[PDB]
Design a protein around this ligand. Structure first.
Ligand SMILES: *[C@H](c1c(-c2ccc(C)cc2)c2c(N)ncnc2n1CCCO)[C@@H](C#N)C(=O)OC(C)(C)C
Ligand code: NA
Length: 307
């Protein structure tokens, strides 16, 4: 792999390291400054002895050109750590910014889901599944609040479909070859990416998550809700929401992964297609962004205990 950058020169040579902006067990995101131009960037630093970042980086190299995918700017490998330099996101988490907008509308929500689902329809069509589309991994690059500034930002769990050979495959070229039940697994992962977008949508419309009330909810109870197939689309915050939007929600959160909408079908839904008939007036939402952040972290911690 030309992703063998161990031979060139120094990250610390060309950038000034600033503060952490995110932390995990085998990687860290810090903010940084390109010494020569004084321009700001983010840099995920990845421990090579703990994880192999090759698939993330390749995916970023091939698809980072997408207007709604985080854009890779540089990358180093001093041997022990890979330094992945990107554009720095100045708009914060998308869902959080939206929840703190008292007058957010259905029309806005549809444009947001369009932009995001368009992006995942493209990834899926190129054989990529994200596997971890939580709302905290979707950010705004600036504070304009335009859909154009949405970025999906972490591909640390993303998977590119391959044949046994180790050769890259698109869902379209299904001739080979390396297709043993791996078929169904990719098919299920893309369905989980859609589910995650259903969760995002639910929460945008009403200001709460469908399967968790706060960070204190036990993982067992969240899983029971998730597996019950049942969730409320009535009353309170749901009264003021169109029936077209509730319909789309039911189909993106459909408990049956085989009945769950595809990205392609999501974009053919009237709530996405006839945006121009969607109301621009206020939605009636709960106002508890921090509680939601907790419930969201709870929902994914409960799902990701194994993975
Ligand atoms: C990293 C992160 C990034 C970022 C994403 C991807 C790559 C290759 C490099 C950096 C980033 C950017 N570009 N702008 C603003 N904030 C950014 N963060 C921090 C978000 C808050 O934690 C994180 C993400 N996404 C991340 O996942 O960090 C750990 C893996 C948890 C350490
Ligand atoms: Na991009």
């Amino acid at each position: 792999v030309q992703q063998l950058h161990r031979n060139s020169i120094q990250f610390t040579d060309g950038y000034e390291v600033k503060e952490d902006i995110g932390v995990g067990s085998y990687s860290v995101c810090k903010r940084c400054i390109h010494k020569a131009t004084n321009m700001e960037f983010a840099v995920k630093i990845i421990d090579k002895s703990k994880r192999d970042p090759t698939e993330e980086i390749e995916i970023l190299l091939r698809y980072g050109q997408h207007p709604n995918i985080i854009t890779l700017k540089d990358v180093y490998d001093d041997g022990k750590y890979v330094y992945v330099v990107t554009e720095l996101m100045k708009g914060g988490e998308l869902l959080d910014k939206i929840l703190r907008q008292k007058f957010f509308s259905e029309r806005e929500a549809s444009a947001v889901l369009f932009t995001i689902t368009k992006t995942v329809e493209y990834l899926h069509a190129q054989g990529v599944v994200h596997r971890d589309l939580k709302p905290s991994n979707i950010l705004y690059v600036d504070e304009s609040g335009n859909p154009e500034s949405i970025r999906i930002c972490d591909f640390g769990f993303a998977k590119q479909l391959r044949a046994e050979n180790g050769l890259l495959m698109t869902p379209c070229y299904t001739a080979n070859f390396v297709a043993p039940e791996v078929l169904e697994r990719q098919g299920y992962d893309a369905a989980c990416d859609i589910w995650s977008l259903g969760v995002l949508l639910y929460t945008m419309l009403t200001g709460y998550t469908p399967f968790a009330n706060g960070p204190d909810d036990t993982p067992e109870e969240i899983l029971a809700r998730i597996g019950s197939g049942k969730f409320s689309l009535s009353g309170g915050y749901w009264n003021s929401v169109s029936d077209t939007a509730k319909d789309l929600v039911s189909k993106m959160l459909h408990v049956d992964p085989h009945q769950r909408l595809t990205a392609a079908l999501v974009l053919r839904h009237p709530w996405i297609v006839h945006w121009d008939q969607l109301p621009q007036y206020q939605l009636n939402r709960q106002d508890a962004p921090h509680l939601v952040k907790g419930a969201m972290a709870a929902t994914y911690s409960a799902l990701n205990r194994n993975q």
